[PDB]
Design an enzyme around this catalytic site. Structure first.
Site, mmCIF file in Angstrom:
data_model
loop_
_atom_site.group_PDB
_atom_site.id
_atom_site.type_symbol
_atom_site.label_atom_id
_atom_site.label_comp_id
_atom_site.label_asym_id
_atom_site.label_seq_id
_atom_site.Cartn_x
_atom_site.Cartn_y
_atom_site.Cartn_z
ATOM 1 N N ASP A 31 1.512 3.902 7.109
ATOM 2 C CA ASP A 31 0.350 3.049 6.854
ATOM 3 C C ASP A 31 0.722 1.592 6.586
ATOM 4 O O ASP A 31 0.893 1.180 5.440
ATOM 5 C CB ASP A 31 -0.522 3.604 5.723
ATOM 6 C CG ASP A 31 -1.769 2.772 5.493
ATOM 7 O OD1 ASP A 31 -2.609 2.682 6.416
ATOM 8 O OD2 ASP A 31 -1.914 2.212 4.388
ATOM 9 N N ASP A 89 0.821 -1.205 0.000
ATOM 10 C CA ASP A 89 0.000 0.000 0.000
ATOM 11 C C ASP A 89 0.858 1.259 0.000
ATOM 12 O O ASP A 89 0.815 2.051 0.941
ATOM 13 C CB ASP A 89 -0.950 0.002 1.201
ATOM 14 C CG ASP A 89 -2.059 1.025 1.064
ATOM 15 O OD1 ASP A 89 -2.169 1.643 -0.015
ATOM 16 O OD2 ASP A 89 -2.825 1.205 2.031
ATOM 17 N N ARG A 101 -0.288 9.590 -0.254
ATOM 18 C CA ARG A 101 -1.081 9.783 0.953
ATOM 19 C C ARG A 101 -0.480 9.015 2.125
ATOM 20 O O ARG A 101 -0.656 9.393 3.282
ATOM 21 C CB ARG A 101 -2.521 9.330 0.715
ATOM 22 C CG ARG A 101 -2.611 7.999 0.000
ATOM 23 C CD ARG A 101 -4.045 7.570 -0.229
ATOM 24 N NE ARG A 101 -4.118 6.497 -1.215
ATOM 25 C CZ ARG A 101 -3.916 5.213 -0.940
ATOM 26 N NH1 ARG A 101 -3.629 4.832 0.298
ATOM 27 N NH2 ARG A 101 -3.999 4.308 -1.905
ATOM 28 N N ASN A 102 0.230 7.934 1.817
ATOM 29 C CA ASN A 102 0.890 7.135 2.842
ATOM 30 C C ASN A 102 2.337 7.559 3.063
ATOM 31 O O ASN A 102 3.171 6.765 3.498
ATOM 32 C CB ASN A 102 0.816 5.646 2.501
ATOM 33 C CG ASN A 102 -0.601 5.110 2.537
ATOM 34 O OD1 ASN A 102 -1.457 5.636 3.251
ATOM 35 N ND2 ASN A 102 -0.857 4.058 1.769
#
Length: 307
Positions: A156, A138, A142-143
């Site tokens: 994350d 992932d 955004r992470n």
């Protein structure tokens, strides 16, 4: 396999004093406060995270497990957890938020030097996770959190899985993974490797070079699989030279072994970081510069090592 002798620190709720809510979503909420150890005369800016069912507590401890087993300058490290009722995850506060929202709100001040440096630091963090036999599964803008404009960290681990000493790939069975960052073999066969994270890295870089654009915008996620099979990939961003864009394409190869390793990505972007205006053409690149009362005993978590 080597015994994971990491230390899970249990924190008292009376130690930290929460302030406000950084964000709220369907996954959970994120708070902010000051962790104050018992009589150590230090205040640590922290971020409290919570996702109240046995199902919720199990998955949040899995993330806590992984997050407490990492030690790299470009990876978010778990400071500790608080046993309240719902388990809270206490980590170092990243004042500037996620990198995705950061580039969208500062695109008119971000130079080529910062962009290439971020690509190096992310590749450094991902390479570390590869050394720990950890597959992120992932990776996205955004992470990626921003401590300072010149220092970012990966995060994350809600989907992160650890590979064995004799394990090469991981098989999924859930159905909650962002398709637009996934490799082709991950979408079709639920196969996740370190080279599948390289694909996500390529898309992540694309997000940054496009100053926070949406990959495959205007295209449904159920059509992404068929599109990739045709050979179609993300377009070449305006600021990107063919040198930088070709690297992204290598991360989007069909053959996973033909894709670059993170250690190779570190070297490549490091070379470009020595002369950033040769590989990224940005208008006005030169004239761009990125920037309580009782806070004299405030110490960053990175300067506060395990007692």
């Amino acid at each position: 396999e080597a015994p994971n002798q990491a230390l899970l620190r249990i924190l008292k709720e009376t130690e930290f004093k929460k302030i406000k809510v950084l964000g709220s979503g369907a996954f959970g909420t994120v708070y902010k406060g000051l962790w104050i150890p018992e009589g150590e005369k230090v205040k640590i800016p922290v971020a409290i995270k919570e996702l109240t069912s046995p199902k919720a507590n199990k998955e949040i401890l899995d993330e806590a497990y992984v997050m407490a087993s990492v030690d790299n300058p470009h990876v978010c490290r778990l400071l500790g957890i608080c046993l309240t009722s719902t388990v809270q995850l206490i980590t170092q506060l990243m004042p500037f938020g996620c990198l995705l929202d950061y580039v969208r709100e500062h695109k008119d001040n971000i130079g080529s030097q910062y962009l290439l440096n971020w690509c190096v630091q992310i590749a450094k963090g991902m390479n570390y996770l590869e050394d720990r036999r950890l597959v992120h599964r992932d990776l996205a803008a955004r992470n990626v959190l921003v401590k300072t404009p010149q220092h970012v960290k990966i995060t994350d681990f809600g989907l992160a899985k650890l590979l064995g000493a004799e394990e090469k790939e991981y098989h999924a069975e859930g159905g909650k993974v962002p398709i637009k960052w996934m490799a082709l073999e991950s979408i079709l066969h639920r196969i996740y490797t370190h080279q599948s994270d390289v694909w996500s890295y390529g898309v992540t870089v694309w997000e940054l070079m496009t100053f926070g654009s949406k990959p495959y915008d205007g295209i449904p996620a159920s059509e992404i699989s068929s599109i990739l099979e045709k050979g179609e990939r993300l377009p070449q961003p305006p600021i990107c030279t063919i040198d930088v864009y070709m690297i992204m394409v290598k991360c989007w190869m069909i053959d996973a072994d033909s894709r670059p390793k993170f250690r190779e990505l570190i070297i490549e972007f490091s070379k470009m970081a020595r002369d950033p205006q040769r590989y990224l053409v940005i208008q006005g690149d030169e004239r761009m510069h990125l920037p309580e009362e009782d806070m004299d005993d405030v110490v960053d978590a990175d300067e506060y090592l395990i007692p």
